């Protein structure tokens, strides 16, 4: 399968998540995603075919994971934007007030701004600290998806937020949204990963 940020993948034929970013670890291909999406050795599938397995993850505390892929996977330095793509150029971290977009299998590509950093989300499973908050909307299924600036600087992967009864926070004003992502920087260093860029 072609690995692009924002597309759907399933875990052990059950849950769905979104791909964050294509990366490599030496000769190994992978993608970064949300920790809450799977446990170590869980099976990742894209369009019904097995593409790899969870190599590692941290959740709760943090919300991160990387999936090692088989060799036949094609890593691409891109993030889905409808039918078009945003080119991954690096990982400079943007500051509070910067505009950012996020891509995922449920609500597609949504943009907004970063409103706060170092937020704690109290999930039922336990607290997740150090999240950055934006006001782009998202829905169930978007987790693990890419957060990127229009300039191509990768920011992190979708963790969670304040979803309403319809499954997203797209029906509430930007001012009331709390959409949290895990920073990409600590995930790349923690696993020794390099981002695929174009």
């Amino acid at each position: 399968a072609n690995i692009v940020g924002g597309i759907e993948y399933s875990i052990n034929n059950a849950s769905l998540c979104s791909v964050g970013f294509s990366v490599t670890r030496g000769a190994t291909k992978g993608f970064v995603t949300a920790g809450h999406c799977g446990t170590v050795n869980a099976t990742a599938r894209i369009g019904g075919a097995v593409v790899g397995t969870f190599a590692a993850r941290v959740f709760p505390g943090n919300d991160r994971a990387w999936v090692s892929l088989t060799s036949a996977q094609t890593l691409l330095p891109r993030v889905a934007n409808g039918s078009s793509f945003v080119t991954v150029r690096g990982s400079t971290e943007a500051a509070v007030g910067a505009a950012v977009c996020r891509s995922g299998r449920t609500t597609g590509y949504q943009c907004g701004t970063i409103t706060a950093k170092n937020v704690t989300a109290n999930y039922a499973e336990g607290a997740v600290r150090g999240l950055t908050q934006g006001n782009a909307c998202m829905g169930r299924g978007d987790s693990g998806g890419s957060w990127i600036t229009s300039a191509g600087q990768a920011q992190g992967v979708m963790s969670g937020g304040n979803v309403q009864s319809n499954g997203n926070n797209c029906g509430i004003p930007a001012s009331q949204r709390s959409s949290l992502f895990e920073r990409l920087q600590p995930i790349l260093s923690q696993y020794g990963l390099s981002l695929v860029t174009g």
Partner: peptide, 4 residues
């Protein structure tokens, strides 16, 4: 807040 929920994970996703």
């Amino acid at each position: 807040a929920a994970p996703l």
